[PDB]
C-alpha cells in the first residue's frame, strides 16, 4: 500500500525539531512511504555517546545513499557542553556533514500566498544558494601586509601588497577560493536550477573584485556554456551572471522563481519555520535536506515544561519532501515524487487555508495581535497536515 | 519673509528626481528659504559636457560648505552611454562625491505611521550606517597563498597561511582596514547618534571573522568611552555592540529609533525606496551630503516623458533637503532653518499619514494590485499637497 521510497539517510536532531521530526515521520511520511531508512540519531546526546562518530557516519551514509534528510541538531557551545555535560564541544553536525559531502547549501523560503514576503511580489519562491574560512588578523601598527602566492612548482613566488600601513595599525585578512569549490558551487547551482526548472543567477562583485569574483563569473559561465547551456534552454530555464547590485534590484522587481547563487548567515524577515536548506552536492546525485532553522530551543523549553508550543514543522516537513523528492528523482520513483510534491502542496495549502503555527499567524497579524485562535499548536498543526495529506493523497488514489 | 538658509551645496540630478527636485525647490524650499546656493548640475548631460568636472566641483563644494543636498543622478552604464551618447562611462557621481568627501553613509527609511514598516513595531526610524578596495588575484595552480604581516620596525613577521592550494588553483584576496577608516566610521556613527539622539548599535561577525570585526567592536568602544560615552549618556542616549544575528532579532523586537552601524562586505529593504533617505556623514562632524537613497526613478521618468501620469515619492529627496538644511541649521545654529527643515519633514510625514501619498506608498498600504487612482496622488498632486500643507504648517507655527 505504502510507496517504497528507497534508501534515505535520516538524521534525528534535537529539542523541538526532534519532537516535530517524529511527528512528521509519524503522521506525514511513514503512513505513506516505506523507506530503507538509514536513520542516524544526531541527537546531541547520541553524538556525545558516540563521540560525534554518528555525525560522520550519517555523512558517509548520505555520501553513499545520495539522500539525507536531516533534523535540526544542537550545535554545541559553552552552554550546550554545560547543559549536556558534553564530553566535548562537538563541531556542528552540519559542518561535519557539509565538510564530508561538500556541496552548496540552498535555502528556499517556501512561500504561502497569505503569508507576507519581503516583497509581496514573490509568488514564486527564491532559492538562494550561498557559497561558503578567512584569515583575518592583528595589524597592531605600521608595516606591510602582503598576500603571497608561492607556486608549489617552485616557480616565481608572487607578492601582492594588500596594504602598507604607514600610519597606526588596522586589520587585514586573506580570503581564498579553490577553482574546485567554485566549480562545485557552479555545478550544485546549475544542478539545483535544472532540479526546479528555474533560471540560475550568479551574483558577484565581478567589478570591484575583478580577478576574484570574476573567477566565479567565469567558472560559472564556463561550466554553464560547456555543460548546462543546452540542458537549460531545453527547459526554458537560463543561467546568467548578475552583479550583486543589479541582482538584488532584479529580485525585488521579480516575482521570484529563480536560483540565486550568492558570493559574499540568518538574514531575511520571513518566518524561519518556512526556510528549507538543501545541501546540493556537485555530483548532482547527493543531496541533504534540512530545515534552515535550528532545534527551536525556546519552543522546546516550553514543550519540556508541558506548555503548549506552536512550532512550524514546514521547514522540516520540506526537508523530508525535498530529500524524498530528490530520492524520487534519482530512482525515477514517480509515486514518491508525487508524494513529496503532495506533501509540499498540502503543507502550503494547510497554511494557505488559514491553518498555521503561531509564528506564521504572527507573520500575518503581528506578534502582539496573535490570538490562540489564530494558529494551531505544534500537534494541532501536524494533525491538520496529516488529515489534509490523507485527503490530498486520497484525491489522487 | 523667507529665512536665511546659508550656503548649501545643491546638486541637481537626473530624470524623474530632477523633476521632483525642482518641484521641491520651487514649492517647498525656495518659497521659504534663501540659500547661498552652490547649485551644481549633476545632470547626466551636464556631467558629460563638463567631463564630470561638475561632480568633482560639487564634491569640492560640499567639502567647503559642509552641506550637500544631492539629487539622484544617473550613474552611467552601457545603455546610458548609448542613450546620452556619453563621451565616456562616467563614474557614479555618488561614488566620486563619496571618494572625495569620505564619511559614512547613513540610510534612513523615513517612517510614516500609516505606511507599513518592515517590522510593524518600528515606530521610530532605524538609521543604518554602512562602513565606507581589496587586492584579489587568481592563484594559477597549487601553492601556498599566505598573507604576511611585517611591522615596519621589523620586530616580527607574522605570516598566516590563507590557503595551501593542492587541488588546482583558484582565487585569493587580501583585504585590509586602517584604524582611520574604522575610527572615521565610529565618529560618523557616534556623531550621527548624537545628531539624532538615538542609541548607536554596532553589528559585526566578531566570531567567524573575529580579529577583523573585533578591531571594529574595539575601536568603537574605545572611541565611545574616550570621546562619546560622555555626550551620549548625557543625552539619555548611548552605544552598544551586537552580533548581526542578535541585531536582526533585537531590532524586530523594538520600536526602532537607533543608529545601526553595519559592517559587511546596498541597503535594499521592504517598503518603498521613495522613503529611503541617505546621508553621507563625514567623520569631521561638519560635512554632510543628504540625498535620496533611491535613484532617478527612470521608469517614472519614461512615463513622465510619454506624458503618462507619474506618482513619484519626493519624500526621500525632500528629506535630502530637510536633512541638508537641518545640518546647515545645526552648523549655523539657524533656529529658523532648523525649524523649517523639521517643519518640512513634519509636513511630509503628516501629509502622508493624512492619507495623501504617492502611489508607491499607497502600494505599501494596500498592495500594488489593490491600489486605485483614488488611493494616491501623482507626483505633482502630492507635491502640491505637501506644498499647501507646508504653507499651512509654516503659517500656523509663527
Ligand atoms: N542543525 C541546524 O541546521 C541548526 C541551525 C540553527 C540552529 N540550530 C540549533 O538550534 C538550537 C537553537 O537555535 P536557535 O534557537 O538559535 O535557532 P532556532 O531554533 O532557529 O530558533 C529560532 C527562533 O526562531 C523561531 N523559530 C525558528 N524556527 C521555528 C519554527 N520552526 N517554528 C516556529 N518558530 C521558529 C523561534 O523564535 P520564537 O521564540 O520567537 O518563536 C526560535 O526560537 C541551537 O543549538 C542551534 O545550534 C541547528
Ligand atoms: N545618484 C543616486 O543617488 C542614484 C542612486 C541609485 C540609482 N541612481 C540612478 O538611478 C537611475 C535609475 O535607477 P533605478 O532604475 O534603479 O531607479 P531608482 O531610482 O533606483 O528606482 C527604481 C525603482 O524604484 C522605485 N522608486 C524609487 N524611487 C521612487 C520614488 N521616489 N517614488 C516611487 N518609486 C520609486 C520605482 O519603482 P516603480 O517602478 O515600481 O515605480 C523605480 O522605478 C539609474 O541611472 C541609477 O544609476 C542614482
Curated annotation (Swiss-Prot), chain A:
<keyword id="KW-0963">Cytoplasm</keyword>
<dbReference type="GO" id="GO:0005777">
    <property type="term" value="C:peroxisome"/>
</dbReference>
<keyword id="KW-0576">Peroxisome</keyword>
<keyword id="KW-0816">Tricarboxylic acid cycle</keyword>
<dbReference type="GO" id="GO:0005739">
    <property type="term" value="C:mitochondrion"/>
</dbReference>
<dbReference type="InterPro" id="IPR019818">
    <property type="entry name" value="IsoCit/isopropylmalate_DH_CS"/>
</dbReference>
<dbReference type="GO" id="GO:0042802">
    <property type="term" value="F:identical protein binding"/>
</dbReference>
<keyword id="KW-0597">Phosphoprotein</keyword>
<keyword id="KW-0329">Glyoxylate bypass</keyword>
<feature type="binding site">
    <location>
        <position position="205"/>
    </location>
    <ligand>
        <name>substrate</name>
    </ligand>
</feature>
<feature type="binding site">
    <location>
        <position position="312"/>
    </location>
    <ligand>
        <name>NADP(+)</name>
    </ligand>
</feature>
<feature type="binding site" description="in other chain">
    <location>
        <position position="75"/>
    </location>
    <ligand>
        <name>substrate</name>
    </ligand>
</feature>
<dbReference type="InterPro" id="IPR004790">
    <property type="entry name" value="Isocitrate_DH_NADP"/>
</dbReference>
<feature type="site" description="Critical for catalysis">
    <location>
        <position position="205"/>
    </location>
</feature>
<feature type="modified residue" description="N6-acetyllysine">
    <location>
        <position position="79"/>
    </location>
</feature>
<keyword id="KW-0007">Acetylation</keyword>
<dbReference type="GO" id="GO:0045296">
    <property type="term" value="F:cadherin binding"/>
</dbReference>
<dbReference type="GO" id="GO:0005737">
    <property type="term" value="C:cytoplasm"/>
</dbReference>
<dbReference type="GO" id="GO:1904813">
    <property type="term" value="C:ficolin-1-rich granule lumen"/>
</dbReference>
<dbReference type="GO" id="GO:0006097">
    <property type="term" value="P:glyoxylate cycle"/>
</dbReference>
<dbReference type="GO" id="GO:0060696">
    <property type="term" value="P:regulation of phospholipid catabolic process"/>
</dbReference>
<feature type="binding site" description="in other chain">
    <location>
        <begin position="92"/>
        <end position="98"/>
    </location>
    <ligand>
        <name>substrate</name>
    </ligand>
</feature>
<dbReference type="InterPro" id="IPR024084">
    <property type="entry name" value="IsoPropMal-DH-like_dom"/>
</dbReference>
<dbReference type="GO" id="GO:0006740">
    <property type="term" value="P:NADPH regeneration"/>
</dbReference>
<keyword id="KW-0560">Oxidoreductase</keyword>
<feature type="modified residue" description="N6-acetyllysine">
    <location>
        <position position="217"/>
    </location>
</feature>
<dbReference type="GO" id="GO:0006103">
    <property type="term" value="P:2-oxoglutarate metabolic process"/>
</dbReference>
<dbReference type="GO" id="GO:0006979">
    <property type="term" value="P:response to oxidative stress"/>
</dbReference>
<keyword id="KW-0479">Metal-binding</keyword>
<comment type="similarity">
    <text>Belongs to the isocitrate and isopropylmalate dehydrogenases family.</text>
</comment>
<dbReference type="GO" id="GO:0006739">
    <property type="term" value="P:NADP metabolic process"/>
</dbReference>
<dbReference type="GO" id="GO:0006749">
    <property type="term" value="P:glutathione metabolic process"/>
</dbReference>
<dbReference type="GO" id="GO:0005829">
    <property type="term" value="C:cytosol"/>
</dbReference>
<feature type="binding site" description="in other chain">
    <location>
        <position position="130"/>
    </location>
    <ligand>
        <name>substrate</name>
    </ligand>
</feature>
<protein>
    <recommendedName>
        <fullName>Isocitrate dehydrogenase [NADP] cytoplasmic</fullName>
        <ecNumber>1.1.1.42</ecNumber>
    </recommendedName>
</protein>
<dbReference type="Pfam" id="PF00180">
    <property type="entry name" value="Iso_dh"/>
</dbReference>
<feature type="binding site">
    <location>
        <begin position="73"/>
        <end position="75"/>
    </location>
    <ligand>
        <name>NADP(+)</name>
    </ligand>
</feature>
<dbReference type="GO" id="GO:0005576">
    <property type="term" value="C:extracellular region"/>
</dbReference>
<feature type="modified residue" description="N6-acetyllysine">
    <location>
        <position position="305"/>
    </location>
</feature>
<feature type="modified residue" description="N6-succinyllysine">
    <location>
        <position position="124"/>
    </location>
</feature>
<keyword id="KW-0464">Manganese</keyword>
<dbReference type="GO" id="GO:0005782">
    <property type="term" value="C:peroxisomal matrix"/>
</dbReference>
